[PDB]
Amino acid sequence: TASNPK
């Protein structure tokens, strides 16, 4: 699972 990489 990947989240927002900002």
Place this chain on the structure above:
Amino acid sequence: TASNPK
């Protein structure tokens, strides 16, 4: 150039 990676 590379040194000892211990």
Place this chain on the structure above:
Amino acid sequence: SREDSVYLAKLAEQAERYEEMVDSMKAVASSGQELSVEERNLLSVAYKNVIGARRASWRIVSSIEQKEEAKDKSEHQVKLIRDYRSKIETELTKICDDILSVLDTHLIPSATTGESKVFYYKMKGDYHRYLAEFSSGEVRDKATNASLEAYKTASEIATTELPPTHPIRLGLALNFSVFYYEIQNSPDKACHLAKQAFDDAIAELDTLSEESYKDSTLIMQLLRDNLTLWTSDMS
């Protein structure tokens, strides 16, 4: 000077020292002024890299605990891993408490634009989610509900004030869908949210300029990647 603290945060990011990047951006966010888009992004990058290293460390120590907790050692050695994990969890806690304190006191009250409102509530949901990751019992439920409501608030503003293709709205949907799957264990909510956000953006994707296109399509692929992996896990 404000522009000096912002510039030092840039150098700190390049030098990959994110503890100083936080200090610089926290000082900027501590002012009454509303952050620009750049300062907003710099602040988020600063805290994510800081919290990211501790989260990464936590997962490793937890794995070592779980592995050695089966027959590999007993008591005192496992005791060492637990006390070391707790030290990290304490570290994770104060980092989360720090940014959340800045969010509640400074950022959220001073935000004029709906774009910044969604952004700040999204962050609030993120670090309450990070808290819910290593937490257990009743203190985990508190962080869960705090993250949920923060995500809900951001979603109501994003839907109203922002187009479906907006990076902050897509990013919010990405993180909230993660919250549903990873924390609340609600695959139906997660898949529905990620798919809906992806679909609403697809239609208007051709109306976006280049820089807007790149930002949007980046998160949309992450949305698709999550939908892909979640489908595999259900099989």
Place this chain on the structure above:
Amino acid sequence: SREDSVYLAKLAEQAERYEEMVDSMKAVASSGQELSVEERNLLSVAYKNVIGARRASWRIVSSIEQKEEAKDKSEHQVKLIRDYRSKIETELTKICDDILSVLDTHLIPSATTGESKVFYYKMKGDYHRYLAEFSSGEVRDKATNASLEAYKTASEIATTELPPTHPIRLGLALNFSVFYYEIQNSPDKACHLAKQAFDDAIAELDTLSEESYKDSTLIMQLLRDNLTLWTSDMS
């Protein structure tokens, strides 16, 4: 307990938190006892990863300084980069001073074996070399001569007390040859030292056990890689 501090250093290495790994191993090295091979290696790994991050950061900030120092900005902005670089150089200094202080006061006086003597003097040469990297003027020459004599001392003991295939002796030759090329700018000394160490090891390589073979051949390839790149730069 000694074995608890050693174990915590292992967890810290796995968790990739090297500041705590240093604190644990520094406490062990601060005791009068002579470090084992494992504790010796753990101590070195701890400080190298700590000093490595700051060195990496320093090179980046230096590059940014040099780049923006040409017409890109003036004064106050360049001033910010310099003051930020100096902060890193101050950080680099105290880290070097720390391990060198431990080396002089604790490790070197308490070393019974010639194997540990070469190791500790090699480290002394390493962190004096790191000091000579960002230093300028007369304070750079001091670090240069301190590193040189520390390397020379280790070399005299290694040649006498250790076989040519020994990892610590090969590693010493690797780092000292680097010192000649990078710091003293003596390509003849560097190439002669690296080639000689490589040749003396080649003959006895087939007399080594498996674990000794892996350790030795690893550094020997690094010796060959340096000789390769140095040859290219001379062309």
